[PDB]
Design a protein around this nucleic acid. Structure first.
Ligand code: GCP
Lengths: 205, 85, 82, 392, 61
RNA sequence: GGGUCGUUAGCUCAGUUGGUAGAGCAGUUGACUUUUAAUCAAUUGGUCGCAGGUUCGAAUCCUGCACGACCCACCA
RNA sequence: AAUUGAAGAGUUUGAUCAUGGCUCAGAUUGAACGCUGGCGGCAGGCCUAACACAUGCAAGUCGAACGGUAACAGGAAGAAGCUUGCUUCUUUGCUGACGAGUGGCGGACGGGUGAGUAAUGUCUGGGAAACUGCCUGAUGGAGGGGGAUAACUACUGGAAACGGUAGCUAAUACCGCAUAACGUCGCAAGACCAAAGAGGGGGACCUUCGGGCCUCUUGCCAUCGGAUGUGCCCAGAUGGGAUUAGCUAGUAGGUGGGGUAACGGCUCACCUAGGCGACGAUCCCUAGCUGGUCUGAGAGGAUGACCAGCCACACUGGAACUGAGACACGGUCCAGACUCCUACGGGAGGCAGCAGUGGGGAAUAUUGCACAAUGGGCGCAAGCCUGAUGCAGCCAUGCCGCGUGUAUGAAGAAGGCCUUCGGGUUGUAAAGUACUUUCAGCGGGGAGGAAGGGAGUAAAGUUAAUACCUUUGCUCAUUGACGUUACCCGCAGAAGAAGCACCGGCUAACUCCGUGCCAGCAGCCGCGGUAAUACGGAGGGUGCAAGCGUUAAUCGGAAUUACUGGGCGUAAAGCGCACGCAGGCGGUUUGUUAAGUCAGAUGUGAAAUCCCCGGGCUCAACCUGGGAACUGCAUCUGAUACUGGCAA
């Protein structure tokens, strides 16, 4: 269900630093970034309309490792909602459990985030969860269970998190790695640039 | 068929046989009156009408006649005899 | 003969009994006059799990419908006062 | 479904062999009625034995017929094999369900080609001791000529290494036997006595991984695919999923049945001759000639090496040596797979009498095991007998 | 009258095979396809690309 | 599993009384010609469906088999 | 809070714009096939042969209806071996219980298939000439008599099945006599009609010592209700063909008789000679219908497998009986075909009930467990049956979730691969290395589904009664099919778990080597003739994910059937033109009416399903409360400008 392939290859495909390989060493710098999609990166794309739409759709899915059919499930779920669908879908994607756990800082990469949920570590409302597709309910808390706490990794996992932008819609105890969920993530804060405008057009046909 | 309910078959057999005889005797007291009306023996016809009166109701009371048919026989047959009474 | 019984709904391993008024000569989940409330025996210790439309119960039983012993014990569960 | 069977006594694998048209099936009728008088009941009539009507148009048992009889000591699953030279391949198949039989040869004839043919292959299939019952002794009351018969059979067994000294050579008649005469009927009783005595009860492991060479698939209209086979080793219950191993590429199958000669049974045991139902299988998926066995414990290959002997014309074999391109059939208990003759560097041809060694290349992959013996038949008669040495 | 796919085949007068619908618009009348890798028309020999089609197994290694 | 008849160059297929493998088109290759086609010629083809037995001589006859087809039982 | 919703491209031509065909990008399925594959949850799983069938099972129960007791454990009179009450055992229905049988109830329910049926069916909403077991309420009764018969004995036909004849006997079986009213016939007076007894407990009374008797639970009988189910009628809607235009003679109706629960040509008799049709009759083809499902911007079109309602059928065709109800799946009678047994004279059987098999086909499963829970039939109850149902199994068939790991990592290696053989790429990828260990696998803890029922005991009603019985607490033992349960803990080591289609443009992503209009490819345009971005393979890369493609069917794009929303001087398309019936359309004024119309209220539009907002399974799928909608239709009352009817 996970891509689980070379996490920097997806980077060069879009050329964008999708923070897949964020880990310990802050910046990538060891792959000749931006100009190395595959074997023939010499050809600058004519890139048709469907391309910019697809390379936008993929780009978003690459940031969180979301599968197409599963992403489309998130899509109609965003459509039946009121307001601006382009904003409703992003909050749904941002509201992922592993996503919030990452945003709290419990891991340098989202890779560990999804992996952490699966191995009986993350505990919300005193209830251990293994489903990464868990839409986080409004105004809650998140934490790590004792018998899986700070196993030489968890502390260092929050190391890069110090130099992150550190979002607003959440906080953390950080003494036990106990995050705290607040309001839903607003559009203006998230995305930064990734055009959700293109995404809604794509699936509409 | 292969069933303990084969008894319900022979019971319906034992039923229909006795049920036939009573229904048979009932209709003959009816035809007797009709035969009389064919002539116009209001004396004997009325007598036969009175004669079949206790036997017509008894059958409907047992579960033979649907008592709506019974009521009809006491009405239309009366309509026949009174028309020549 | 009309009666009050359960309707056995809900998924596999998770029964959601619908206390319904219907004729005994019908199917379990078959044709029914009206579902007179519901009942969930496994509605984990929370807000709901049992609702009997007491209004039509007295009305229908006061017509010829017999309550089933399960629901009869459920009337002892919904306790007219408790 | 009918009658669940009881584990009273060991399931011994016996039967009959012999020269064509020598009343082997005839004796079969008498032995069963013996236990219908000395035991509870096991009687079988000559006509009841012959299952096919075409066998009632020739008298020869074209389709191998099994009968059932049991002594007050042990049970005996019988295998009446035809003596016809044109029906020896069917004989070798049923030989994978015997450990000792009854050499039924007409007393007036003596050791002949087809008597000699069925005996050699016996060793190559796994049949060590066979008590010889010579039938038709109501027409040849001459002791002197017949003393040579019992004499030369012991010599005939020595020709094929069978120690004919311990095995009794018995004379008797089946005519008066089954037909009510107290005399020859009691002579069959002699066969009822020797059967329990001489041949002991070899220890067929019921704990060893499941193995059952497919004897013959039966059309049980009502249950589906039912197949019989000798559970030479192990046990099997109504529910364990085993595979179909052999010619076709192996796959599993649930054993939803265990029955013995139309009699019910819960679980199987070693050395047992029983029929088992296989869940959701076409009649032609599994086929007469393969092997049923436990999954994950056996792998099949095609080649193996062997020390081979060719029948000389003195014993009844072919005439000349065979050259490269010759492809007879090697028989592994119940399989008639054709095998190309790979002669190594030096021996370009094998004379009818060479005990040479060479590599074998069959046409179909069978569950390989170094040691499995095989009979070689082609041209109407036997062209060899050998043993698997090494698989590649 | 369906077209026999695969660069080379092994069918002959009987071969009970499977037939999938497919016109060719290359040969008139032909509007069907033989199912390569079916009942009798087995997998095309030496195929590495598109083995879901042609019914070819995954390489030995 | 049984017993009865088939299988031969690229193709359609030969080879009677057991004497030694090819015929008509061709697949293809050169020529005529708008390319040709046709056809004239050129090249070729089987370990006689696998082999063995009797054979001086076996594609012919004697069976057992892979690939086909009919009836016979196939009834733990 | 309850529909915020619509895309195109390639292709005729030298090239252009139109018209107009074709084709695909999407999604869906009761899908199969190929390649592949780790597990789990929740659904689905013969659409073809309404073809045929071995075996097991699918509806039996009540002794609180009765005579009985052939069985089973006891009681009792006796007996015998011999440890004279230790036990052996014949009697015996006296008990607990219970075959066969008589009787009562159900078996017409639930289950299955969709052949037939084009409308006697369905869906929608009104109507009146209807019947109604069990359940519930209420008004009276529940008196007294009679003749057989099953069982069981005996003789006995027949292969068997199935019987026959002569004796024996009961009942809540059957039949009279009586008695009846607000019941039935009749305008009325009058006339006529019903039945059933058992079970528990017991003081006085009383024992022909069976019991009469007191009392309670219950059942039976008759009348009026109600509920429910069901029958019945009317209008409308509910597929194709006009290359079917005519159809019919109980056919259209009256009266009279008969018949049904009910009215009726439902059926006869006489008479009338009509009635059905162009807003499509009849005949033929095809077909289960509806809520809904798929798709669609909506409108529609197609479909309607499943869940659910209704309808039809039960080997084929027909008929009838018992019964409240069938004109009947596991009922009968007969004829026929197909099978089985045969003693050859004669019978026996219907898997389209759950599994299962043969055959068919591209195509789909266990001859599992249990009535634990729900429902149903019987019964006072306990209990018994239940292939409905609740589960388990088989299968990637679908929907959803998770995992196969993560981090560091330049030596920018090995090798594959391309080359301007500089270099690049594969490639943080791997290795090495730091940690984590989900699910599987093994070893241990462990909910919830379970409400009851049973016995004992307490109190409250009832009654002569502290008894019997009903209601309500306490207590004990408990009641688990699933079940190696949900879930949790531990152990082990990254070890067991990633492939599949494609890369000319459509439409995401490139070259080399080789084959030479050969092999080949393909949805459309189309590619291949010695240097192929499409063929075969290699490298790289893309899409997707336990799935991916292919085939097929449905719809959309298709505004190429256009109502919403198209065309007709020439692209297909104005009849050659005119008169003219039905039909459709209709100037202007006043007034009225209120069918159409509009507004409001009400009944219904079933539920499940789609939509909104919440809740519970670790989340989801799914289950799911409440609401919304169900666009319709009927009725009453209003507005009455407009269309229409009617008057000048
Ligand atoms: N003298 C004598 N002749 C006998 C006796 N029994 C049989 N025969 C004959 O022996 C012959 C073989 O009979 P058969 O029963 O076919 O034998 P088989 O054992 O089936 C033979 P095949 O091997 O062909 O199948 C027949 O001729 C039979 O009549 C016997 O007791 N005595």
């Amino acid at each position: 269900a996970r891509y689980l392939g070379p996490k920097l290859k997806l980077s060069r495909r879009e050329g964008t630093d999708l923070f897949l390989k964020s880990g310990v060493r802050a910046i990538d710098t060891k792959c000749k970034i931006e100009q190395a999609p595959g074997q023939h990166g010499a050809r600058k794309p004519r890139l048709s309309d469907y391309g910019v739409q697809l390379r936008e759709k993929q780009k978003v899915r690459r940031i969180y490792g979301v599968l197409e059919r599963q992403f489309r499930n998130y899509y109609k779920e965003a459509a039946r909602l009121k307001g601006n669908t382009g904003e409703n879908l992003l909050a749904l994607l941002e509201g992922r459990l592993d996503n919030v756990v990452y945003r709290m800082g419990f891991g340098a990469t989202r890779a560990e985030a999804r992996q952490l949920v699966s191995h009986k570590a993350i505990m919300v409302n005193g209830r251990v969860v293994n489903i990464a597709s868990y839409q986080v309910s409004p105004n809650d808390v998140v934490s790590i269970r004792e018998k899986a706490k700070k196993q030489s990794r968890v502390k260092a996992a929050l190391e890069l998190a110090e130099q992150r932008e550190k979002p607003t819609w959440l906080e953390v105890d950080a003494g036990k790695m106990e995050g705290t969920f607040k309001r839903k993530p607003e559009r203006s804060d998230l995305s930064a640039d990734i055009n959700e405008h293109l995404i809604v057009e794509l699936y509409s046909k | 068929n292969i069933k303990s309910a084969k008894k319900r078959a022979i019971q319906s057999e034992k039923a229909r046989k006795h049920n036939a005889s009573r229904r048979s005797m009932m209709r003959t007291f009816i035809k007797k009156v009709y035969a009389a009306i064919e002539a116009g023996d209001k004396a004997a016809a009325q007598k036969a009408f009175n004669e079949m009166q206790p036997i017509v109701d008894r059958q409907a009371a047992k579960g033979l006649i649907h008592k709506n048919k019974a009521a009809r026989h006491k009405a239309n047959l009366t309509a026949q005899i009174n028309k020549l009474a | 003969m009309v009666t009050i019984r359960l309707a056995r709904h809900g998924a596999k391993k998770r029964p959601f009994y619908q206390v319904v008024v219907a004729d005994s000569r019908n199917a379990r989940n078959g044709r029914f006059i009206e579902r007179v409330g519901f009942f969930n025996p496994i509605a984990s210790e929370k807000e709901e799990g049992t609702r009997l439309d007491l209004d039509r119960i007295a009305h229908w039983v006061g017509q010829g419908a017999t309550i089933s012993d399960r629901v009869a014990a459920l009337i002892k569960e919904v306790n007219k006062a408790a | 479904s009918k009658e669940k069977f009881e584990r009273t006594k060991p399931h011994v694998n016996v039967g009959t062999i012999g020269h064509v048209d020598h009343g082997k099936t005839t004796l079969t009728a008498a032995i069963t009625t013996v236990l219908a008088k000395t035991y509870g009941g096991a009687a079988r009539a000559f006509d009841q034995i012959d299952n096919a009507p075409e066998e009632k148009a020739r008298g020869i048992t074209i389709n191998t017929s099994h009968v059932e009889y049991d002594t007050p000591t042990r049970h005996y699953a019988h295998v009446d094999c035809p003596g016809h030279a044109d029906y020896v391949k069917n004989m070798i198949t049923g030989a994978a369900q015997m450990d000792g039989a009854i050499l039924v040869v007409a007393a007036t004839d003596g050791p002949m080609p087809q008597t000699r043919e069925h005996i050699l292959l016996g060793r190559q299939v796994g049949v060590p001791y066979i008590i010889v019952f010579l039938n038709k002794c109501d027409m040849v009351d001459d002791e002197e000529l017949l003393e040579l018969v019992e004499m030369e059979v012991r010599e005939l067994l020595s020709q094929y290494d069978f120690p004919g000294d311990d095995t009794p050579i018995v004379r008797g008649s089946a005519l008066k036997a089954l037909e009510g005469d107290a005399e020859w009927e009691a002579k069959i009783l002699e066969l009822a006595g020797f059967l329990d005595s001489y041949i002991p009860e070899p220890e067929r492991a019921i704990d060893k991984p499941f193995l059952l060479p497919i004897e013959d698939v039966f059309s049980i209209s009502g249950r589906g695919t039912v197949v019989t086979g000798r559970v030479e080793r192990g046990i099997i219950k109504v529910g364990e999923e085993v595979e179909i191993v052999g010619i076709k590429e192996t796959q599993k199958s649930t054993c939803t049945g265990v029955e013995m000669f139309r009699k019910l049974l819960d679980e199987g045991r070693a050395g047992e001759n029983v029929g088992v139902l296989l869940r959701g299988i076409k009649r032609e998926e599994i086929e007469r000639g393969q092997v049923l066995a436990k999954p994950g414990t056996i792998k099949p290959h095609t080649k193996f090496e062997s020390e081979v002997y060719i029948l000389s014309k003195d014993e009844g074999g072919r005439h000349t040596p065979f050259f490269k391109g010759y492809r007879p059939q090697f028989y592994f208990r119940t399989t008639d797979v054709t095998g190309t003759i790979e002669l190594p560097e030096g021996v370009e041809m094998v004379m009818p009498g060479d005990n040479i060694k060479m590599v074998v290349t069959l046409i179909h992959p069978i569950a390989m095991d170094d040691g499995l013996r095989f009979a070689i038949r082609e041209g109407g008669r036997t062209v060899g007998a050998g043993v698997v040495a090494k698989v590649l | 009258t369906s077209y026999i796919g695969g660069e080379g085949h092994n069918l002959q007068e009987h071969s009970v095979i499977l037939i999938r619908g497919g016109r060719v618009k290359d040969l008139p009348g032909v509007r069907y396809h033989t199912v390569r890798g079916a009942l009798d028309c087995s997998g095309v020999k030496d195929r590495k690309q598109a083995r879901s089609k042609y019914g070819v197994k995954r390489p030995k290694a």
